Amino acid sequence: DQRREMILQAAMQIALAEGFTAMTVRRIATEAQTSTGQVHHHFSSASHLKAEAFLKLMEQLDEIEQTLQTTSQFQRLFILLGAENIDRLQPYLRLWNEAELLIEQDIEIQKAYNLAMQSWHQAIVQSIECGQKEGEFKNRSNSTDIAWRLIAFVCGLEGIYKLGLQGLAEEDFKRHTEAIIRLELL
Amino acid sequence: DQRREMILQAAMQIALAEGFTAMTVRRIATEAQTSTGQVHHHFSSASHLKAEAFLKLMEQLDEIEQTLQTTSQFQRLFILLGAENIDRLQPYLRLWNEAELLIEQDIEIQKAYNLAMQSWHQAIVQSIECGQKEGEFKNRSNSTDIAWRLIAFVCGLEGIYKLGLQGLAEEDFKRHTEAIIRLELL
Numbered sequence A, B: 001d002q003r004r005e006m007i008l009q010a011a012m013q014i015a016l017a018e019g020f021t022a023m024t025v026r027r028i029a030t031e032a033q034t035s036t037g038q039v040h041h042h043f044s045s046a047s048h049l050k051a052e053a054f055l056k057l058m059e060q061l062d063e064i065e066q067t068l069q070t071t072s073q074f075q076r077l078f079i080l081l082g083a084e085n086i087d088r089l090q091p092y093l094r095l096w097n098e099a100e101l102l103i104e105q106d107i108e109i110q111k112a113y114n115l116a117m118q119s120w121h122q123a124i125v126q127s128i129e130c131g132q133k134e135g136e137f138k139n140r141s142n143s144t145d146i147a148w149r150l151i152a153f154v155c156g157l158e159g160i161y162k163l164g165l166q167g168l169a170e171e172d173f174k175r176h177t178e179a180i181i182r183l184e185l186l
Helices: A003-018 A025-032 A036-042 A046-065 A073-080 A087-102 A107-132 A143-161 A170-185 B002-018 B025-031 B036-042 B046-065 B074-080 B090-101 B107-133 B143-162 B170-184
Strands: none
Touching: A003 A025, A003 A036, A003 A046, A003 A087, A025 A036, A025 A046, A046 A087, A046 A107, A073 A107, A073 A170, A087 A107, A107 A143, A107 A170, A143 A170, A143 B143, A143 B170, A170 B143, A170 B170, B002 B025, B002 B036, B002 B046, B002 B090, B025 B036, B025 B046, B046 B090, B046 B107, B074 B107, B074 B170, B090 B107, B107 B143, B143 B170
């Protein structure tokens, strides 16, 4: 189809710029420049169209991610973890975090989130095994265990920085992350 | 003094067995066998009594963990990081997580939660530096650095578990903690 996917990118723009709470069947029918009723037509609910615009935008994240010229596999892993936080991807990472908080209210979003994370894991699993088969990383451990623990660590470092804890500086994020990568893989 | 403490000890009993929501000054008063007027004389609000009891219970969880005799610091870290699951210690852990979600609605519990996390870190810092001087731990990094990264990792792991991610097993928690401690300190 064409009119459906053209609403899908209308969702995408509003999603990526103004988040989920601005994604109303009305306002995305407005910028798609169709009718509200045509939006009801394709997608079976607004929450279904919110999750569909998320998933397909995370797949936009990771496949603009496969295009960046990296120098080493360590550098490509650092970007994959989200630890580099480049500008071009900043808002895709914004939506990811909004989605993470909406998973208790909206199970379409909660389904989409669990699909994004599963691909994130297999994308890091693919970065580890590639660096290992190329002489860049060592084979200290199972690559699925490393990847689950690198996800654990980068998510856990965020959570602790959320607290305003005393004596824990946010400019040590890149430092602590890089350090856990050398321990696991270098 | 001594009557403020009878009320405190009553708040902690409700807290451990039932949780914060059950800690109304109506309920505390009954169990402390006093008047609701007397509770208000000693604590500003149910939220102040809640946070103050949460702190005492964390001091109490601390004092229980130094009664479990350990052979070394490495197994002492397993106790400190929660990755060991003692039956006695469950409801203190339970209350810790309950408190975690109440830190954006309640300024009192938010203050206590930070203080408890900051003493948690101190303890992990101190157990790293015992092992280091007893010859058991390397000194690859700052004790404070390893200690924060150990905190970020365990919180980050319980977080990922919470999502019901496919192909992630809650069994592996003690495994993944054991690996992180080895990369850092042994």
